[PDB]
Structure 1
Amino acid sequence: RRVVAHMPGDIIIGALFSVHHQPTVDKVHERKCGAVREQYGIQRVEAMLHTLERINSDPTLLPNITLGCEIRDSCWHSAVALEQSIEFIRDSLKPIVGVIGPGSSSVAIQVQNLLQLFNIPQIAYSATSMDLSDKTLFKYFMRVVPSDAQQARAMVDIVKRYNWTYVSAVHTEGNYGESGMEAFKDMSAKEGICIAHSYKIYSNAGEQSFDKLLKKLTSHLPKARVVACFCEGMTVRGLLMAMRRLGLAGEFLLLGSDGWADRYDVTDGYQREAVGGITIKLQSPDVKWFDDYYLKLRPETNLRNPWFQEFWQHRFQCRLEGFPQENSKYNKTCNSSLTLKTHHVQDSKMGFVINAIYSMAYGLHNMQMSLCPGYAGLCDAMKPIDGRKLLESLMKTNFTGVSGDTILFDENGDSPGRYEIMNFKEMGKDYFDYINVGSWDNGELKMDDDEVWSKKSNIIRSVCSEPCEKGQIKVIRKGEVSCCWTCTPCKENEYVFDEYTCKACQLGSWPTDDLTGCDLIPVQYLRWGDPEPIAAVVFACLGLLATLFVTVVFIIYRDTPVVKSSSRELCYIILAGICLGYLCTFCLIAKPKQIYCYLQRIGIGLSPAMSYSALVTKTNRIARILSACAQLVIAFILICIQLGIIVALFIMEPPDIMHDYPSIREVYLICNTTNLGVVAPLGYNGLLILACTFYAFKTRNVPANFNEAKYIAFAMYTTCIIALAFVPIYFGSNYKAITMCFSVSLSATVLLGCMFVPKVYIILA
């Protein structure tokens, strides 16, 4: 059977330390674990052997009673550890009062399922699963190291700190890896992280499995460069050997967990491939007295550690002759000058092992003090040491560790801890070692960003797509990982609403700069000034001066017989209307306002009706004679026909400015002028024009005072064509106001030019 390392005592506590390597894949069934381990094996085994013969020699802990030990090998396998635990409990079918729990979390679970039946407390130093924190299933399990929830949080913090978004995930099969990845996914995908794929692999899988895994990992190589390994000690080594085999030598940045840590045995011979990796290590200062005791050890003297001779032969490649464990495999013979001092590395968690073997001692001491305070030794009430009492005392245990910090188990049998984010760099030529960079204690991580990536060209960001926010572009996600987007550009009309929708602005509106929001488009009107309104207003002003001159001539020659042929008042109402129609242009081309446009409508309406109606009455009188003072009256009544019409139109169309939007980009303001509200007065004016066309066609060339009718007929004919010429523009355009102004102005200055100008032209003679 297997060998065991006894040491005598009054109270015996067990331990399970992974002295030998994991059994190979092909010999799992035989359960014959392979090579020996130094750090995880002989160092730990020696620690107990010492940290009990310190406790025994110390009078202040457990006086007059001697803790012994039975240290037994678990080969880091759940099957072997279970058989060893069975060997532990064979006595209960001297009793074992407790064990120092095996390193692996899955192995810890397997051994706990058996130990809790016989009420045997178990203390772990490296088991770091969340699954072991549930006291319903694991009542008799306590740890001196924090859970790996905090470790997953630390890894997530590291990932989020360096913009890393698109990462790959690898985890060892078991409880450690499974729980690690579960926590990592749950608490990462929430915040910002985005896992490309997750792969699982056994520690003892063949090289073929690792090759396949590396191919699958390289499948996403261009984008996902960070691999987040909640993996174990040997899984990462397998990955490194696969990397060496496949020729890939630094396209990945492995992001380890507390299986890689500070360990040198996982990067021996493959330092070129793992350079740049970030690991997370439970903090524990190196003990000193253990080194002093350990370095002086020799294979000749240490008989109490049955694995010592084999390890001694394995480390320095030679053989021992004068001892049974010759192991003739090694050729040369060891000389009496070899020592462990050279290339001596004391692993992490050597603080934790001693802290455990203490916590157990302090629990025993407290329960001894409580049960029989008077006696000093094994009292009658202690001979069958009760598991329940021991666990009750152990739950509330509280002391100072070797590191100087204090140890307390909370309600979950757990102890708090701080992480230390190591980094694998290359100091000199062919010289690699782990460099402490950061830390993480209770959600706060201090990181030396300078030490990692001693430059500004850090590792390529593990992102699926570049930041898509340069302007109008707006990301669309194609069903796959929510962190792969395309850069589809929205249109100029819309602005980015969120980041996945862009929404159109109002009918009169435009997106602001940088597409941040939307704001009202500036309004445009016919400003006072401008090219064309000057050409309008100068025409209007010169027309006003001309008509003032004409009325001055009229009033001067008030009683002249050559002009006292027609009704003088009739030849007045014309010019008054002309003047009003002239000021109509001025009140038309102006800043749109409530007070202005109704007056503008009145101007465009009445003047070219009343003046032309006076002309109609004059032509009526002439044609009928070829009456009395009633004609001035009929004029007034004829005018009014229109005043009533326009006042009626004023009701359904009150003067109020509305904004016009011919296109999405420009906005104009005009009042309630409408096609129906303009055509009707223009229609009436047109009807009057057609009525007076008949009388024009009647008069032809009648010999009158200075041949007035001959000029007025031609004038009215010209006005007809000028009026009908401008309709296509006015129907469809944005120049309605200026066109109306021009049309009115040009319709005027023509009738006066032929009805009054020749009279004034010859009035000088």
Structure 2
Amino acid sequence: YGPNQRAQKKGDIILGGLFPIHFGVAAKDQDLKSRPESVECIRYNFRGFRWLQAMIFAIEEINNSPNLLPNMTLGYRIFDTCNTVSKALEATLSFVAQNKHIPSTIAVVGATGSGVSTAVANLLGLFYIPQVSYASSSRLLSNKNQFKSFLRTIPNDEHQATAMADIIEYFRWNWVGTIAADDDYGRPGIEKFREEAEERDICIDFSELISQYSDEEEIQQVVEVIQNSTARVIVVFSSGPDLEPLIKEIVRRNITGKIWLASEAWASSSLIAMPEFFRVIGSTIGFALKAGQIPGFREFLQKVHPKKSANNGFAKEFWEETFNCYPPCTGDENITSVETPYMDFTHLRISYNVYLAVYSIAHALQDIYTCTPGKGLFTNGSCADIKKVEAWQVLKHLRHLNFTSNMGEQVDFDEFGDLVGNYSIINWHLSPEDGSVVFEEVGHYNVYAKKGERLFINENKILWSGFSKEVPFSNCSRDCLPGTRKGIIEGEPTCCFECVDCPDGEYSDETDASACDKCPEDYWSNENHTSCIPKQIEFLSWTEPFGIALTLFAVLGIFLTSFVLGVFTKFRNTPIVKATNRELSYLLLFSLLCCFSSSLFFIGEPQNWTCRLRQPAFGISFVLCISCILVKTNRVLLVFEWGLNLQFLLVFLCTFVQIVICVIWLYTAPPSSYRNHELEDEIIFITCHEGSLMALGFLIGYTCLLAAICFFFAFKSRKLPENFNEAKFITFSMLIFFIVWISFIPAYASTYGKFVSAVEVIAILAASFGLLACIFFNKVYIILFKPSRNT
């Protein structure tokens, strides 16, 4: 006969009912020293009584409506579960009694716990009795090979975990921790969330299991792992009662920084949503089912009375727990005078599910009632009769039930027995009028939209941590700027890293970089390694300051030479001084002008033209000059041997020799004007590799031997003072030439491109200048100052 505290009402058809009027049982572990007696449940739950009242109201409204099942009445045998499996199981045993004078229940609306409903459906489905639950939302109840006769008016919990992952990815967090009740409601949900979050590149720090029967040390361990971690977001998948101990311990230890992502079961629970817990838990964003509309329901709630309820048996205990009677009292108080979750509501969510379940079973019964004897759902097109209806026929009609909810909706269960709905997203607020926690809706989750466009959050209503209004930071490691790269911290997950600076020559312009990048050769990483500033190029320039000095020196040399040439041109036909060789004079002067001009080739970038011309350019020009001044010496060879052609002919041997060398590189290995940087790695010199070294040596040596013979012959006879004994002058000249080159070799041996070229040009320009000077200074002086030209 089941328990004695129950709600009961007769009728042709009887429906079952399991509601959590209490919260749990008295935890007195029977040591079995005596016969174990029936355990007792302890706490009270006004929400559960609201649900039971909703079911009773639905049945009464069905019995009152004249169209749905006329000339037939609905009865019920509603029991209490106290949220435990033992009570539900004894109740269901009282249900299926007559199967194998007692009424035979045809349908069961209840089992609000996914652990409770599992154990109930295991037993009901053995007799094929339809069980229409309203609040059990575990996914395991979708295995229609196990629970053959289980339907539910509440959506499955897959979309809830998906929505949790979507919310976490929307605020751009990647470091969270998960808590789930060690039950059939938290385990599968947390596993689904784990996979959905790992596929979205989200890292999970810790994962713990709790329960209302967990001892104190395990709660200590959980609080420790919560405190010892850096994750700010905590995804809780549990119900009110199985969460209350952890909340009490967290309030006692005063952990304040975290953010709670509430699941639907406890996001609106009065056990948790109280101010003293609110000050500590801070910000909670949770889900909620869609509201309902049961017109005329409040006026039914306001009529509950202990004496006017013979059918209802829990009304007495309700009166007691709400007024503390039997301190005996009157029984004529007002339910509106005290504030309890009973009528302190604005949106009916689970009560609407109970209403809908009762109405769906009534509609299946009507469907069986309005049959046509030819188009039935059973074998041979036959159909069943409502006077001897059995449970399996009602199950058959429920599987194919498809009707219209008074809100103008379509109600029809899937092939997995469940419905589907679109969640509201609420965020906990503190009412400035009362102090109580009030749930304000801030977002929506439509599950029909395509994957990726389902969530809609209105961020300006979310109140963060009570005061501030910017999204808190809950990443593992700080995201560091461009110029740096991620660096593995071994042991830690893929979301936690250090970041190391990029070396020079590599850059990174992106945030969250995986590696730095080498830029092309003529580019180089800048001072912040964020962008390769185009590199600089090494060579002498014309606007260059020291290049300016050099070029002005060259111009002055040419000016002096040409002006002296013109001054001669005054006396150019007064052989008074031209007792020397006129043509040799002009030739030497022009050779010097051109050698000077050669410096044109050392002030800018070398194209093959520039380099391979300039170098041999000096060669020929200076060699001409030297040979000319040399032949300027006494005619000893002429004395030893058809016009003076000889003199010209003489020079026009030596010259060719070196012109010879030029042509060789013209077709063997001409110098290469190319870019070189390997010795600087930051700036690219533009140098000119010698075409054939030893052949340059040969050239220079030939020239120096010509100069050396000139030197020897000018000195050895340097003491024959003819017209101021220019032997000595030219000797001193050739020696200056020697010394300059000598001393300047080192620099050429120990320097890069730029100053190498600069020193080379200085050397040449100045040496030729000195030659010209040493040869003319005296003569010009005398023929400008002492016009004593008779001998």
Superposition TM-score, scaled by structure 2 size: 0.86
Q: In 2, distance between residues paired with 1:583 and 1:370?
A: 120
Tell me, yes or no, if the aligned pair for 2:611 and 2:671 is still in contact at 8 Å.
Answer: no
Name the residue aligned to 1:711: 729
Q: Of 631, 649, 668, which aligns to 2:665? A: 649
Q: 1:381 to 1:397 in 2, by over 3 A?
A: closer
> Structure 1 stretch 734-743 or stretch 133-142: which is displaced more?
133-142
Name the residue aligned to 2:422: 418
Q: In 1, distance between residues paired with 2:698 and 2:631?
A: 22
Q: Of 449, 456, 469, which aligns to 2:460? A: 449
Name the residue aligned to 2:503: 491
Name the residue aligned to 1:193: 202
Shift of 1:355: 0.9
Q: Deviations over 1:426-477 (max 9, x none)?
A: 23376122231312222132324245147545574223333311x4233323
Unaligned runs of 5+ in 2: 377-381, 447-453
Which secondary structure does the structure 2 equivalent of 1:723 belong to?
helix
Identity level (%): 29
Tell me, yes or no, if the aligned pair for 1:7 and 1:68 is still in contact at 8 Å.
Answer: yes
Q: Deviations over 1:709-765 (max 9, x none)?
A: 110000110111111222222231331222222111011112222234433333452
> Does 2:356 align with 1:355?
yes
Name the residue aligned to 1:747: 767
Q: 1:561 to 1:14 in 2, by over 3 A?
A: same
Tell me, yes or no, if the aligned pair for 1:82 and 1:111 is still in contact at 8 Å.
Answer: yes
Name the residue aligned to 1:281: 288
Shift of 1:146: 1.8
Which secondary structure does the structure 2 equivalent of 1:706 belong to?
coil
Equivalent positions of 1:427-466 (< 5 A) are: 427-428=431-432, 431-442=435-446, 443-453=454-464, 456=468, 458=470, 460-466=472-478
Q: In 2, distance between residues paired with 1:512 and 1:408?
A: 67
Q: Which amino acid aligns with 1:465?
A: S
Equivalent positions of 1:377-388 (< 5 A) are: 381=385, 385=389
Tell me, yes or no, if the aligned pair for 1:128 and 1:176 is still in contact at 8 Å.
Answer: yes
Name the residue aligned to 2:451: none
Q: Of 102, 109, 114, which aligns to 1:105? A: 114
Unaligned runs of 5+ in 1: 320-331
Q: 1:403 to 1:279 in 2, by over 3 A?
A: farther
> Does 2:709 align with 1:700?
no
Which secondary structure does the structure 2 equivalent of 1:547 belong to?
helix
> Does 2:175 align with 1:166?
yes
Equivalent positions of 1:243-642 (< 5 A) are: 243-246=250-253, 248=254, 250-268=256-274, 270-285=277-292, 287-319=294-326, 332-341=327-336, 342-343=338-339, 344-346=343-345, 348-370=349-371, 372=373, 381=385, 385=389, 389-401=393-405, 403-428=407-432, 431-442=435-446, 443-453=454-464, 456=468, 458=470, 460-469=472-481, 471-479=482-490, 480-496=492-508, 499-511=513-525, 515-552=529-566, 567-618=581-632, 629-642=645-658
Q: In 2, distance between residues paired with 1:662 and 1:380?
A: 100
Q: Of 685, 689, 700, which aligns to 2:703? A: 685
Tell me, yes or no, if the aligned pair for 2:134 and 2:350 is still in contact at 8 Å.
Answer: yes
> Structure 1 stretch 263-272 or stretch 478-487: which is displaced more?
263-272
Q: Deviations over 1:616-649 (max 9, x none)?
A: 5555955886966334224223222222222322
Q: Of 633, 655, 663, which aligns to 2:680? A: 663
Q: In 2, distance between residues paired with 1:672 and 1:165?
A: 58
Which secondary structure does the structure 1 equivalent of 2:223 belong to?
helix
Q: Deviations over 1:55-78 (max 9, x none)?
A: 122122122233322323333234
Q: 1:432 to 1:620 in 2, by over 3 A?
A: farther
Name the residue aligned to 2:745: 727
> Structure 1 stretch 749-758 or stretch 167-176: which is displaced more?
749-758
Q: Deviations over 1:564-604 (max 9, x none)?
A: 56654444443333222222112321354454333323323
Name the residue aligned to 2:379: none
Q: In 1, distance between residues paired with 2:182 and 2:246?
A: 15
Q: In 2, distance between residues paired with 1:561 and 1:380?
A: 151
Shift of 1:116: 2.8
Q: In 2, distance between residues paired with 1:519 and 1:426?
A: 56
> Does 2:138 align with 1:122?
no
Q: Which amino acid aligns with 2:682?
A: R
Name the residue aligned to 1:322: none
Tell me, yes or no, if the aligned pair for 2:430 and 2:436 is still in contact at 8 Å.
Answer: yes
Name the residue aligned to 1:323: none
Q: Which amino acid aligns with 2:365?
A: L
Q: In 2, distance between residues paired with 1:586 and 1:433?
A: 90
Q: In 2, distance between residues paired with 1:735 and 1:128?
A: 84
Which secondary structure does the structure 1 equivalent of 2:485 belong to?
coil
Q: In 2, distance between residues paired with 1:393 and 1:624?
A: 140
Q: Which amino acid aligns with 1:486?
A: E
> Structure 1 stretch 554-563 or stretch 299-308: which is displaced more?
554-563
Q: For the aligned residues, what is the CA RMSD?
A: 3.3
Q: In 2, distance between residues paired with 1:79 and 1:698?
A: 135
> Structure 1 stretch 489-498 or stretch 295-304: which is displaced more?
489-498
Q: In 2, distance between residues paired with 1:678 and 1:486?
A: 58
Q: In 2, distance between residues paired with 1:372 and 1:274?
A: 62
Superposition TM-score, scaled by structure 1 size: 0.88
Q: In 2, distance between residues paired with 1:491 and 1:249?
A: 43
Q: In 2, distance between residues paired with 1:663 and 1:388?
A: 91
Q: 1:126 to 1:690 in 2, by over 3 A?
A: farther
Q: Which amino acid aligns with 1:118?
A: F
Name the residue aligned to 1:327: none
Shift of 1:201: 1.0
> Structure 1 stretch 513-522 or stretch 169-178: which is displaced more?
513-522
